[PDB]
Structures are given as structure tokens and as C-alpha cells.
Amino acid sequence: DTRPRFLWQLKFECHFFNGTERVRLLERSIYNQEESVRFDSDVGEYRAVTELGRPDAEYWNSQKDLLEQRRAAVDTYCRHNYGVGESFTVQRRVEPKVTVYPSKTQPLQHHNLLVCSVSGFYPGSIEVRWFRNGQEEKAGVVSTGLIQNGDWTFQTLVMLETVPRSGEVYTCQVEHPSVTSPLTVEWRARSE
Amino acid sequence: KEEHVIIQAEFYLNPDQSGEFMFDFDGDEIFHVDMAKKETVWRLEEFGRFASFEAQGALANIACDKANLEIMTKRSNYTPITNVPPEVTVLTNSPVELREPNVLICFIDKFTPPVVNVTWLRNGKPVTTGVSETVFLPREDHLFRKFHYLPFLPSTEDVYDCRVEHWGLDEPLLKHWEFD
């Protein structure tokens, strides 16, 4: 249908630095696509973002009880949730599955894309490097970047432009917090 | 340089009367509250064995969200939302091996309002077996992200589409996948 829509959002964002040593809470009201009023714990009181949010900031800031709750919330809310959730979120680690294959079946000495597929991992932070005969290839790397699967895993495809010669060994090397030593998978250009 | 962010995100939408309450951790849904069943739904089952959340409290927040919407609606002189159509991408969960189970992911991104019709099509026909989905995930630009899933058995013989309808689109958007 064509009926106009009107949308409200509310977000409480707990931002964590250095474990829980530094915590910043951001509370935000959003009408349609515009944030109207916010509480930022680094500020300590509500502030209007747009003009429409002015009455709400003034009203809420007049109530001592609210302000005190909100100001302690980095402890009673953010640190608390981080703590109870820690084992299965912050500390979640799932090892990537790493597979290497040519994008297409091309003859030696012909241009090709060597695909390093790195899938099923958590968390997102990861390093994927390509080596040709033990040497790091910095150029010709075509990456999807980090892909969020929506199920608490990530994947990435890191492809190398190659002109492979007989006997060459190509290595995809993966560093990730789930393993104490780099994962490596090799592709060997056929000896012909 | 933050290490982590946890977000409690809620919305209410008129005239649809649709609400959502969810927790997000570094971009992934921890859980949401089912508005129909009024119960906490954990995105991964294991979470539920080790954590708890009172679904009732979310409903009370939703009531508040609805009230706030109606106030802002009037206050803005009934300024409606601008539709922002989704980007849609279909991919698999892992590299395809013919005749080995896998999962098609329909990745829907950067859209608002949070209402979409999503249909999986196999060879042009709707399929519902084993399908699942996330709720709407929040974005920093206040648009939404959403995932739909279709377990399938890869074959050279089938083609797939994720068919997505949104008010910001002129026509339904079919995003195609077949083995290559």
C-alpha cells in the first residue's frame, strides 16, 4: 500500500575500551532517520540533537532520579551485561575453515585467480596473507573484506592474481585469535 | 578503537503496529523478543542455556516506544519516513561442493522502514523447508540489515532467487544464484 509510515527507534549502546576499564553509554531516540535526543555518559545529561528533541531533553534533565540512574548505568547496565554475557560473546572463538582453489581451470602461465576461502570463523578480526614460494605477495590481492553471515560467523574470500609457473607453491596464511599459530594451506602449480 | 559494543535496539512502526526489541553484540543478534509469543528467542540456542532475560520488560518498553512514536508523529506535523530501498546479495555459507549440504544466505542491507517480504524461489517456485531468518538488525546510519537462510543441496540442475519486496523498490527485486 501507499499509506505513509512513521518510525520510532530507541538504542542503548554500551561501548567498551580496554576490557571494561573504559565504558561509554549512548542512549538515542530516532524518529524516522533522524536522531532527536541523546544521553551520552561522557556528557552526563540529555542533549537535543535536532530541534524536535528539545522538550524531551529539558523534561528529562529536570528529574534527578533519572539522571542518577542514567549516570550509574555504565556500571549497573553496561558492565553488568558485559560480565554476564562475556563467556559466549566477548570470549567466543571459532576456528576458520580454510580452503584454496583456482577460480577457473586455466593452463600454467595463464592469468588466474587463486581463491583462499576462509569461512565459519569468529570473531571478525583476522589476517589473511598470500605467499609465492615463501615470499609475501602484496600486489594483485583481491579481497571481499569481512563478510558477516548473521549467525555469529564470518567468512572472507581473499583472491590472488597469479601467473603460475611449473613447480610454484602458493600459500594462504591465516592469523586469527582462535589459533596460537598461523593456519596455512598450500596450492602447488603442477610440475609440467 | 573500541573493543566491543553492545546495543539494545527497539523500534515501533505505524500504521503497521510492528515492534521489535533485540540485543546486538558487535553487529550480531544475541536475542530478540517475539512479539506474537511474548518470549525471548536466542539467536543461537546455547545462549539460552547460559543467560536469561525477562521478556515481559521488553513488551513494556515497546508500549513506551509506541507512545513516543505517536508523540513524535504529531510533533513533526506527520512527517513520514523516506523509503530507502535495500541492497540485496545472495551468497553461500561455504564453498560449494556439488551434492553436499550448504546454505544460501540472502543478505539485505541499508534499508528503511523495517518491512520486507522475502521469498526463496527454487526454479521459480517458492520453497519454505528449513528456511529461517534474523529480525531486523540496527545500523549506525539508523537503517536496517536482515538475513534470510535456505539450506539446500547444491546441484548443476537447480537455480535459486531471493525475491525481495520493499516500498522503496519500483518492482520486486530478484537476486539470483546458481552454481558456476
Binding site: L10, F12, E27, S29, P55, D56, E58, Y59, W60, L66, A73, T76, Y77, H80, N81, V84, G85 | Q8, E10, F23, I30, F31, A51, S52, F53, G57, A58, A60, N61, C64, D65, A67, N68, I71, M72
Partner: peptide
């Protein structure tokens, strides 16, 4: 996990 309560907007 605990929630933060939604605050009702000013009504003028």
C-alpha cells in the same frame, strides 16, 4: 541480561 527502560517523551 538486563534492559534499560524506555523513557516517555515530554507531551508538549
Amino acid at each position: 541480561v538486563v534492559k534499560q527502560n524506555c523513557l516517555k517523551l515530554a507531551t508538549k
